Design a binder for this molecule. Sequence first.
Ligand SMILES: *C(=O)[C@H]1N[C@](C)(CO)[C@](C)([C@H](Cc2ccccc2)NC(=O)[C@H](Cc2c[nH]c3ccccc23)NC(=O)[C@H](Cc2c[nH]c3ccccc23)NC(=O)CCCCC)O[C@@H]1C
Lengths: 231, 191, 202, 212, 231, 229, 222, 233, 204
Amino acid sequence: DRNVNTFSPDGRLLQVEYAIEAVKLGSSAVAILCPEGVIFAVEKRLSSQLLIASSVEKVYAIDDHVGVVMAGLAADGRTMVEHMRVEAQNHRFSFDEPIGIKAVTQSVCDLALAFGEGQMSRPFGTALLVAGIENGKCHLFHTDPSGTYTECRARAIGGGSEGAEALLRDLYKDGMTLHEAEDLALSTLRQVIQEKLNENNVEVACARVSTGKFEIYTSEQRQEIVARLPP
Amino acid sequence: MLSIVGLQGPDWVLIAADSSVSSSIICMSENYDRIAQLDDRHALAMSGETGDCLQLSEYLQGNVALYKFRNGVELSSDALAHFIRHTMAKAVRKSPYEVNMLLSGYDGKPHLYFMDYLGTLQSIPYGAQGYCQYFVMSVFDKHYKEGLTLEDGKELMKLALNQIKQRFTVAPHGFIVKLVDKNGITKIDLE
Amino acid sequence: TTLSFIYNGGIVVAVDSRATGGQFIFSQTVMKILPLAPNMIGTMAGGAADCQYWLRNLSRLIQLHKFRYQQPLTVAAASKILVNELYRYKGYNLSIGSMICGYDNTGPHIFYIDNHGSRIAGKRFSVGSGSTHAYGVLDTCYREDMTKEEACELGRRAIYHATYRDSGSGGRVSVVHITQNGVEWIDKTDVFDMHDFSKTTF
Amino acid sequence: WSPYEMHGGTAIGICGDDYVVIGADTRLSVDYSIDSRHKARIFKMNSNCMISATGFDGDIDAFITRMRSILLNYENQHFHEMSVESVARCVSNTLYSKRFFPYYINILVGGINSEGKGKLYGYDPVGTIEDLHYDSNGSGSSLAAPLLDSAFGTIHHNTRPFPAVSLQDAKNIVRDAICSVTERDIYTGDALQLCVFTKDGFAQEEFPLPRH
Amino acid sequence: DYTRSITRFSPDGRLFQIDHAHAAVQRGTTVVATRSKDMIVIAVEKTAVAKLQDPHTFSKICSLDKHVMCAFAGLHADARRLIQSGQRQCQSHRLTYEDPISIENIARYIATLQLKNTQSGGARPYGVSTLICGFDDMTSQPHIYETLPSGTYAEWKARTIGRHDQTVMEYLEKHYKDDMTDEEAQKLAIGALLEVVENGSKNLEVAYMKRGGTMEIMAEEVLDALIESTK
Amino acid sequence: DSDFSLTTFSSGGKLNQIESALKAVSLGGQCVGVKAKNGAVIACESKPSSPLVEKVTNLKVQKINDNVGIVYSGVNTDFHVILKSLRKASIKYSLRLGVEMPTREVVKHAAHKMQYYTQIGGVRPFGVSLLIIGWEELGPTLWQVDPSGTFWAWKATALGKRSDGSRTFLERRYSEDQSVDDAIHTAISTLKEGFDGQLTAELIEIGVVDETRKFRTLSTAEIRDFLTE
Amino acid sequence: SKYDENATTFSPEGRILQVENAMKAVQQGMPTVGLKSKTHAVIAGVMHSPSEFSSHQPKIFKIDQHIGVAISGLTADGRGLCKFLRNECLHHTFCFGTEIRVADLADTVALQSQKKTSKVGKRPYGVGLLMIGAGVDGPRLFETCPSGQHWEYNAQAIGRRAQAAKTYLETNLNEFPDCTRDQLIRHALRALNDLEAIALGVVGIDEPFTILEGPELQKYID
Amino acid sequence: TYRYDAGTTTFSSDGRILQVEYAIQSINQAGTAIGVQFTNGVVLAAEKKNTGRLVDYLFPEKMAKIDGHIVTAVAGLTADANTLVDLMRTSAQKYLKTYDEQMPVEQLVRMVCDEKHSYTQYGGLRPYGVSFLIAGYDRHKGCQLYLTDPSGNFGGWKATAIGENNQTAQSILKSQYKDNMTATEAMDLTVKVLCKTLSADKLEFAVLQFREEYGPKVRILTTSEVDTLMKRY
Amino acid sequence: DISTYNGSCVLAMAGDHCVAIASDRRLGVNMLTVSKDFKRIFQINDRIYLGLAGLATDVLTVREQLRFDVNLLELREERPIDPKKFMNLVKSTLYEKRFSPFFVTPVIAGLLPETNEPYLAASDSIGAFAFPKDFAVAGTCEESLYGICESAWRPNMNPDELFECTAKCLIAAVERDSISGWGGIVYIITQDKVIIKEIKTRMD
Ligand SMILES: *C(=O)[C@H]1N[C@](C)(CO)[C@](C)([C@H](Cc2ccccc2)NC(=O)[C@H](Cc2c[nH]c3ccccc23)NC(=O)[C@H](Cc2c[nH]c3ccccc23)NC(=O)CCCCC)O[C@@H]1C
């Protein structure tokens, strides 16, 4: 009935809130930032064993230094990833430097409210966790369909986002190691999903300060993290 | 204005092209394929700026493939020739494709089309674009028999290409010659 | 003078470093090899701004394709991207003479690209005012079964002779050796050091 | 009708281990006529770099305005001032954005990078970028270029390490080169804006030049 | 021009238009794509054709390119538009890049067309799921991507779209093998469709693309032989 | 946004805006057409809103070109839009081809315009049905174009108020071998049946395509003569 | 309710209910206080904290060398408005070489939002700005509203908890004109009760606009 | 505001474009159009929408020649059918201009169907409430008959029927249609189907016939020819 | 020049209830003979033929645009386009390109539908149409044809005599035009049949 651009009497953008709900319906993704980098651990919802897990990607390498992990509508997150990649390469071309993590996050969020009626028809149904290395510093941001990016040290988006926040509230510390960050991300993901966490149903990535690179973990690295998990 | 020659036979078309590409006075390559196989049935010899012949070849081959995929059928040699002529006429009105072509084809029957940059489409038994048309025509005229055997046709094409090599001042280092027949397009060596 | 040749050991790309507007040498340290991908470089010949901007833009497009798609972008693909971008400016008086050289799944590849839209695959190319002299060195001294040192020296010497016989070529030969293992920036050698002053014929 | 005036005036940049000295004559002249005698052609762009421009003054002003707006956009959207490398790339891209209607201006981006090192970039009107250690632009570029080549011998031996001079030795090289250019170039003179970018930042001196 | 937000989030976070496009896909006929190391087989159920209907050149299977097969389930005209865009895109990729478009790239493009329709104001979503399959190169593994009306795409070892997608997918999961041969993949697809076709020889059609080959419709005799071997 | 069709199919597969425009036609003033052997006639009730109205300033029977004439039943203003469009189309046809637009081509252009307004967004259908008379190779031809852009030929017709009774009256009274004189008399009679009160020459407009192939609008004097003959 | 569907629809009482909904969006934003003196202007905002491990999302922004905006409401709308403000600043500097005035930026923002409400299909900016700028016209504080109007304030409080801050500003309103920059920062901090969550951008007739957070703000937290 | 927008290019809960479904209903309430593909050609036979003693059968209401090789029959709104006929004629002539070849029937069908589908999927405009029986000839598929509906979905049919009582015509065609029919046999079958599912004046016919030397010819039977065909039945 | 790029020679002629339209068969690229099978005369309809003299490019472009237009007009009007109506169509097609003219000059030879009267319509490149009752000439042999036909044309030529002058009056013109010739083809459109006679011209 009412336009997608309608504000609710409370003052909330109804379509933005509904897109946030769509995000809440997405696969769980946990970004844990440690002084040694930042780790994405996202649930891959393998609906079938014939589904190629490598093709079901929530983690996208925006650039060599920055990447994103999605929660919600995978295609909308794909469009946001396309914009972020174009903008990271455009920044590299325009300024001969890697795009800042805040810069690329803000760039993708400027596209979030670009929907309208009477441009996009609707908000993005995907929330992002953008983690990267800017000038040797690990940065992590979370973007919701509202286009509100906030820098995070430990965030979770998707199905168990509230539960993941509750778990991290007393599990995340600011002085963890990269190994500890991996353990915390994978554990929070396991505790906020409805399946078991193996190297095939989880996608892990690291924006690493040591290498200054956003590398999505191979199967062996995910297996190592899974094995090291205490439970 | 590179040398491309064509020789339609009873059931084949020998389509030769200057195989040497040059950057001004420098012969950059000696095996450059100027006969763009638009289809398994059609080889379009092109004569002109290498970068306009490449772009026209890519467009024409992509449109032939698009016709074949969008419509399950393939373009006829006449239909493809007229599509190329339509492209060239639109261009010459807007931005001429400075590419003179010989469209050899075999859609069940051999076809050879003179296709100037303007959009002059003409079915020919033999022909040439470039300055080689001033050197090869008489050869063909003096030696083309109706119903040539493919080997007699190869000898005739060798005759025309040797005429280019011997009498054309800007003589190609060599030619890439392709046979377009019921077996498709095959790079044949005239020896 | 830029040049790039494929031999059994890989691609040797040797470029001079002279930027000359008119008769004045504006630079002798300009970088005429631009790395496009880990295993692929592009050479610069013609308009310096055109060559460097468009090789940089080709690098951006290659990176965009790399991040967008798992399928590696071949050297043929990079050359085709660059030649389509340059043909987009056909009639704009761009001046790019480049060799997109590198290793892909199919092995070594050199594609000479120019603003005119030409895209010629080959095992041996030389672009620039001194290209004829570098060709004189390459076509004569080139062997497929050269050593890495011999091939790098062949490219270096072709560029050096082009610099000697070409006013528009000079500076230092930057020699890169591309293999399946990536682009190896062999070295920058001053052609002044390469000149044999014992010899008196040239 | 050529949309330029080809004003003239010479700029000379010399980068050092921790400094970049660009000295440019301030004369704005064309066709044997001096429009201005003090038209600063070196501009502090941010806390990291300065841009010297020679050539058409309208294009110099247009390009410097565009670069100032670009740097302001960068500082707003990144919360740190654009680095000399980023400003140099932006200068290249801006000059090439007018590739077919060029800013007939030669640019020297002289600044200090995040490492504290002096970075000098020379450009042509269409945006070729040379990361160099000394450059000359303008009507007296031909006069000054051999002077810097002698001072550094980089042209003579281009693979030898750049013989970086003291900040004051670079300032004196630029001053002497500008004085020679002024003695021989009719479009160079009336003053030398000798700008120095160090870790301390942008420091501008004015030196009288022959006004004939 | 018309730019209404046809696809918009519902209060529960769903794009109901995408759900209706999925319903259109379901009302479409069943397709099953299966992969052997050197082959890709797409078996599509022919719609119930009377004696008066021409059974040639109306298969749901299509070749996006000499290396890309396509089949669809859903609105035939929506899929026709998608296939036209996909073929134009394969040729456009050949033009821009000498390389043939990777199956990931073309599946991404088609799914992005669907995503744009779910994002474009005034555009109905494509009521079409597309099994886009092929080989990136000669040495590349066969790929079978499934792109949905939502614009999401995922690679599959074997997938089904359209009506009976549940049943055909269950058959695929029960009968899939890691290293099926060309004959085994053909049998898998043919049996998976046989479970939900009134007639085997008539209602079922097959098209296979072997490694280093183009789309190839199964001979009626060979198709019958495979059907009888399965039964 | 504007460009959404307000003429849309209803549940029964009916364009309800089309039926609404046809209703507007059915309240738009009786217009009659009668195809003679040697011509065609388009008469129409032209009862002015007031006697102070100047008849010639707004005539329902109009000439599209030398050979094609048009009357309408429905909204006078969008009939004038249709008429300007048809005259412009026939002038364009003459410019392109050196002859007046054929009767059937004028009819097809009117139908195309009406259909366009039935399909494009932001507009309603034309609230006029046109009776277009003109000659063709095979003889005179009366055509009806509906608000929907559906056109078809007629031997006799009525479109406006009380057009059902007028069409029944034409079914009863129309004959194939009528002359243009008899077609004009039939059109006047049909108007009389569809009109209450004294039906005078000033209250009706008659256009005729006769043996000459040219369309002419009968003046009030000619209409009076026909009434009194 | 039925009139609350478009920013283009007036209600029978002459109100644009969608504009008021965007206003309520602003009112539900984090507290933001602005103060004005004869020579300095300050905007102190309690940056939102979506989570305990999330750095407070910045709300005090740097627009022009002497103009800064505190955005309260939809952050993405505020960022789009800030891009528009950068365009206006860039065009003013291009045309005249001087920094645009915060009053002119407020006028442009008001016009943009009013356009967003005067045409269907486009929506009012859910964000409200507190723009402080010290230019030739002096220090000036503007509260730009989603409806497309701005109010020039000596002081103001917007967002949640704004009533107490507004009352405090009213109490010390007559003090602000002559208050020193440090005194003005202190007044802003007092008026704006949450430390790390509080950014504070201060501009002056001489000093450019600069943002202080946490440690930089400690000297004035008191 | 879209308060009165019908969302023509919008899916329904069932996944159907309601406007397209209603267009299909409109067609099903329109005059029957039958296509029968015989050995060399296709017989299209439609029921005129506007009939009566006072109607003049000067032109084919439903039959429209698209090109020398393609003819069409219309079921549904003859107005938007005429629009799509103009577009089909222009597309066939554009193909002839580009390729100097007669447009293949399936391509012309695809073009009109892409127009219909573009109206079903974009623009918020009502779909073309017309179903076409496009008979045609091309060297690739010989003689063809295609049924196209407002969705833009088309299919080849040896014989088919649309419009009023299209199911009864379909059943009769199933019962009596045979392959390798002659022109006379297919015309007789079409007349029989039309009469059994419904007068020469009301009916109109168009025979596409391919002769080896004369090529493909479209002949829309006039009133007298249709009267003779009916009297033969 | 581009008008003489493809040497052309088109000659329509009026007889007694019969028209002729002849053309040289050469496709020449300036001074080079590419083909002797070039078609410049095209049947527009049974009683309209169009000889297009000029750029083979524009010959085919205008023949196919006119075929597009005439096919559409005959589909819409369900009747063949009249020679006068086709003349106006050609005039419109050529003046639509007034600022970028086709380098083709048309020669329309038809029989009027009713009286079978010869109808000649020659125009310049932009559609300035003459309607000679004797003969229409076009192509690089234009002046040659004008002179030979002005002397040669006689009223009431029957199809045999009409063909005889079309052939002779075209042979004389092409054999003086270096770039046109290489055989001729004469279409004699009479009230009941079209006789296409390929005539021997000089092949030099
Ligand atoms: C082989 O023998 C070498 N020949 C030379 C000429 C290289 O110096 C080229 C062809 C070379 C290509 C190149 C690539 C990358 C970096 C540098 C050079 N060409 C040049 O150096 C050109 C020569 C030139 C002059 N005018 C034209 C027009 C079209 C094509 C080529 C040229 N020089 C340049 O492009 C100038 C480079 C430059 C760098 N700093 C400068 C400061 C001041 C002036 C010029 C500078 N740029 C211009 O001329 C820009 C003029 C803009 C006017 C609006 O390389 C091969 C290997």
